[PDB]
Amino acid sequence: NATLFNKLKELQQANAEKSKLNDELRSKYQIESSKAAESAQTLKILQE
């Protein structure tokens, strides 16, 4: 019973930290993708 309960708890902890990890990757992904988009726009006017 205790084995089952502790596996549940560690899985719960992993699940709890995973969301915030995803959010952080999302945040820094937006940060870089901004500069990606503007650099694309520079290359666009160069094509023009």
Added chain:
Amino acid sequence: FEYIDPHPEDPRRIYRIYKILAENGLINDPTLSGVDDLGDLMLKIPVR
């Protein structure tokens, strides 16, 4: 943590569609990246 049931309108959709194409030789981009050297049957159009 509703992560079993996320939103139906989802960013993940586009990738799977793009993925299935390169499984049939239509796209020669291996990492499933929207870059210029796609192949011979189609032609990527930039999105602004």
